[PDB]
Design a protein around this ligand. Structure first.
Ligand SMILES: O=C([C@@H]1C[C@@H](O)CN1C(=O)CCCOc1ccccc1/C=C/c1ccccc1)N1CCSC1
Length: 704
């Protein structure tokens, strides 16, 4: 009983290694044409009234806003005599950066992104203080685009400098210790627009050096690899200022080349392409800089260590036969990151069965000294420099918005103190609980899953479930706080489940590789098995399951609705990759071939064609679940044509179906992108639309 927008079908046949593949909506890849704009408008004119017709939408939006309305803080970061921290009074579109002269002083606004946009669509993206804390560089992004403009302020005064760096994307921000400028990345000029609405591929990223007090036209090109247009040049200046550490990436795997420049031995100031020394000249493993003491550099690596470890490489004797293990790989836990504090101490953060743990190690020996106690959850913030004597860290969990701890590092015992508690106002979290289960996938592998629910729940199959997954790119889905999840559990009888399917990083690089490239189908099998587990154990029934994922998790949703429409009642795919044959042709999509392969390869095509959601829509005996696609017109990470073409093809497939009664809809936002930096107002509206769609499609019941 739904009438879907018209969408012209333009037969386009292409040959993939002998296999003919036909598509009909390639015209939707042009975001600027009147035809595409009319399609977008028509889809919004269908979905918006449907979402706005939810009879509980006002209560739902009000409750999400009320739960969300609590003051928020980042860890305080020391920079000289001042601490800097982000603050949100509760519902501001963007958090404000405050400065205070000591932890006990009156704070003052240092940088307010809300003052830069009337709707909060300008966000920070990357920040870096100079080594003397007298200058502050920061990136600004508009309308959610990955494109960045780097600007500069005096610190702590916050006075603006004129320096403005354009065409920045995926950028380093590394000050030299002479305080004269910084290294950053940018792309040379390109055909067409560069505002986040274009689909143009980004290649040949350059490393530049900008001198404070000059126009960007004077910036020096310091590194480029034109014979490797997909290489991306990470730049960091060593803790002593002497070395530029160059970490070169190609694609999204946790591996990099490792080169360096001796800046103090240069016979001239930074003037042109720098002469570097190669330490690691391959992509076999990760080398992530932690710290250095003179020429001895400490790196996190996965070299022969899928769960990660720390090694020492001395630049004075850099052959691999001289490298030394500093911290052994753990038998079971993934080392997520390490930081050096108070000259010779290390904070190591591990993931053990999808929960974070913190330990203090000595830098000289690598030996473990202490554990910093935590509840079950995630460490989402950290501050603590080698030159300072205390750390702060922020903890979050499903029922805990935040706890900030402070720990003095000057003695041989470590007794963290609670610095701040961030709680929802007037909400009894003790009515709810989280369980961790391990369910068998098709091949026998046990997969972790968190289930958040009201205490006293009985397993009668009656509860609506929100089942979330991602499954890729070495990303672990660890506990975190969601205000809308609380509203779902409190007022909509909901059960929230997160399946830690393969492709993520939860158990290290073997977990990641078990869910990428030719093994990508394992991810979808794992997620389908999660739904089967919830049904079999009578948490829910298929008709009451909503699946949700974003980005690579939107691919997860698209593949799962094609493969097992019978397992789900509703599906919400945000900013999803859905044309798996062409993803690599747009913006930064070429970087994802390390998880997906590429249709340019015969072997990879045989894998991709089996699951590419755009190419696998088929009516089954069971109807497809209700579907809501969400994207933004400035999502230049995953270009919105993915959602647009999938929507056109799915609506066409079921145009004349008697059995398809669930709606298949899309909402295309304006002035927003992939998600980072999206203003609070848009986030709350999106969450309201998501749960409104579920209410209207799987029969949720609101209880006051
Ligand atoms: O978004 C994604 C994936 C998932 C996750 O891997 C990130 N990612 C990207 O594509 C990020 C774009 C490539 O960036 C890099 C490439 C190589 C090495 C480093 C970087 C990032 C440095 C940087 C970035 C920003 C600021 C400063 C520095 N997907 C969408 C659909 S599935 C994949």
């Amino acid at each position: 009983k739904f009438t879907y927008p018209n969408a012209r079908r333009d037969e386009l046949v292409e040959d993939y290694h002998g296999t003919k593949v036909t598509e009909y909506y390639r015209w939707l890849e042009d975001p600027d044409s009147e035809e595409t704009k009319a399609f977008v408008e028509a889809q919004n004119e269908l979905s918006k009234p449907f979402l706005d017709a939810c009879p509980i939408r006002e209560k739902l939006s009000s409750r999400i806003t009320e739960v969300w309305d609590y003051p928020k803080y980042s860890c305080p970061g020391r920079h000289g005599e001042y601490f800097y921290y982000y603050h949100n009074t509760g519902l501001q579109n963007q958090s404000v950066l405050y400065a205070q002269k000591g932890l006990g002083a009156d704070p003052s606004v240092f940088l307010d992104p809300n003052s830069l946009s009337e709707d909060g669509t300008v966000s920070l993206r990357g920040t870096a203080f100079s080594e003397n804390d007298q200058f502050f560089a920061y990136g600004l992004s508009k309308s959610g685009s990955d494109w960045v403009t780097i600007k500069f302020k005096k610190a702590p005064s916050g006075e603006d400098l004129p320096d403005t760096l354009e065409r920045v994307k995926f950028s380093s921000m590394a000050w030299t210790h002479d305080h004269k400028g910084l290294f950053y990345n940018r792309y040379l000029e390109q055909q067409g627009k560069s505002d986040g609405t274009e689909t143009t591929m980004n290649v040949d990223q350059k490393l530049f050096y900008h001198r404070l007090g000059t126009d960007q036209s004077e910036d020096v090109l310091v590194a480029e690899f034109p014979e490797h247009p997909r290489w991306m040049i990470g730049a960091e200046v060593s803790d002593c200022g002497r070395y530029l550490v160059m970490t070169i990436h190609e694609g999204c795997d946790p591996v990099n080349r490792l080169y360096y420049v001796d800046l103090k031995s240069m016979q001239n100031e930074i003037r042109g392409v720098l002469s570097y020394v190669k330490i690691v000249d391959n992509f076999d493993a990760e080398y992530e800089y932690i710290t250095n003491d003179g020429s001895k550099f400490t790196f996190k690596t996965n070299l022969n260590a899928s769960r990660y470890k720390l090694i020492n490489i001395d630049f004075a004797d850099p052959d691999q036969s001289n490298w030394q293990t500093l911290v052994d790989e753990d038998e079971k836990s993934v080392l997520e990151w390490a930081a050096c504090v108070n000259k010779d101490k290390l904070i190591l953060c591990y993931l053990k069965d999808v929960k974070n743990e913190l330990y203090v190690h000595g830098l000289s020996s690598g030996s473990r000294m202490s554990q910093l106690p935590l509840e079950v959850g995630s460490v989402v913030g950290y501050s603590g420099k080698k030159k300072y004597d205390e750390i702060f860290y922020q903890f979050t969990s499903f029922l805990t918005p935040g706890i900030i701890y402070r720990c003095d590092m000057t003695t041989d015992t470590y007794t963290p103190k609670t610095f701040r508690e961030i709680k929802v106002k007037d909400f009894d979290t003790s009515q709810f609980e989280t369980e961790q289960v391990f369910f068998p996938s098709k091949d026998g592998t046990k997969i972790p899953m968190f289930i958040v629910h009201r205490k006293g729940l009985v397993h009668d199959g009656s509860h609506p479930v929100m089942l979330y997954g991602y499954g890729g790119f070495n990303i672990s889905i660890t506990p975190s706080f969601s205000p809308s999840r609380l509203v779902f559990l409190q007022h909509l009888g909901g059960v929230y489940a997160i399946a830690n399917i393969r492709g993520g990083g939860e158990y290290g690089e073997s977990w990641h590789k078990a869910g990428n490239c030719a093994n990508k189908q394992n991810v979808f099998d794992d997620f389908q098995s999660a739904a089967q587990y919830l049904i079999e154990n009578k948490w829910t029934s298929a008709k009451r399951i909503t699946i949700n994922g974003g980005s690579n998790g939107g691919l997860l949703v698209g593949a799962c609705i094609n493969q097992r429409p019978d397992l789900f009642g509703c599906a919400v795919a945000q900013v999803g990759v859905l044309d798996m044959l062409r993803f690599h042709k747009f913006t930064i999509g070429h970087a994802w071939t390390t998880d997906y392969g590429s249709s340019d390869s015969t072997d990879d095509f045989k894998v991709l064609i089996k699951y590419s959601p755009l190419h696998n829509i088929r009516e089954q005996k069971d109807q497809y679940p209700a579907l809501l696609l969400l994207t933004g017109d400035h999502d230049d990470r995953v270009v919105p044509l993915h959602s647009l073409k999938f929507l056109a093809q799915i609506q066409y497939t079921f145009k004349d179906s008697d059995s398809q009664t669930n709606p298949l809809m899309g909402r295309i936002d304006t002035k927003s992108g992939h998600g980072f930096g999206k203003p609070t107002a848009k986030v709350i509206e999106e969450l309201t639309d998501i749960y409104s769609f579920m209410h209207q499609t799987v029969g949720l019941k609101w209880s006051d």
